[PDB]
């Protein structure tokens, strides 16, 4: 039952056509959590199809687990995306309007006073406070799931303690905003919907050329 107040965030943008960024936040059968976001790009303007092809099947799958304990989720998370990405590459390849697609995909399976996150791509995961924000996850950059039938995600283990806010993005966010402005932004009073609404609206206003969507997350 491990779960942060926490919130998706998306907008396709002032500079773009479709939004080919997609995400969830989805609970399994205890009522665990896992953040999931997915920045989709290539085959003939199908960005969109595997962004989400990713997220359902991240989706599905957990819906489908009972429990995943901290000492479980980092195969839980690596076997599954391989399996995706496997599905995803073959899936693009039977279809000649899909050959070429991909999407990056950073996710989070929450825990009490930890997160477990796997990042393929140059989304990002970030955990801040008052004093600094740190990014957790290292752009691949570009590596993303579809392109190739193998991937190799990197995993990482995240102790919240002394954090206030978890975040996950697509590079629209932090390709026009600074580190330290979303940090001063956070250390903020205000809300998730609060933040989350300023926090879009920034990057609009830094004039992002791309979709920008992020979940934000509430550390108690
Ligand atoms: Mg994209
Ligand atoms: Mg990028
Ligand atoms: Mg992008």
Known sequence: GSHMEA???????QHRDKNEDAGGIFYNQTNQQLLVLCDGMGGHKAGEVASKFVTDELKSRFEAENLIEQHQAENWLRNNIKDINFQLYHYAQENA??????????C???????????????????????????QITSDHSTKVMGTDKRVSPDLFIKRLNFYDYLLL?????????????????LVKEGTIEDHG??????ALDNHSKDNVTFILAAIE
């Open 7 to 13: 919130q998706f965030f998306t907008d396709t943008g």
């Open 169 to 185: 993005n697509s590079d629209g966010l932090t390709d026009y905003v600074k580190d330290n402005e979303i940090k001063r932004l």
């Open 108 to 134: 989070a399976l929450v825990f009490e006073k930890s997160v477990v996150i796997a990042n393929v791509g140059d989304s990002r995961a970030y955990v801040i406070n008052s004093r600094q924000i740190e």
């Open 97 to 106: 309007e899909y050959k070429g697609m991909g999407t990056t995909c950073v």
């Open 197 to 202: 609404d300023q926090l879009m609206q920034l």
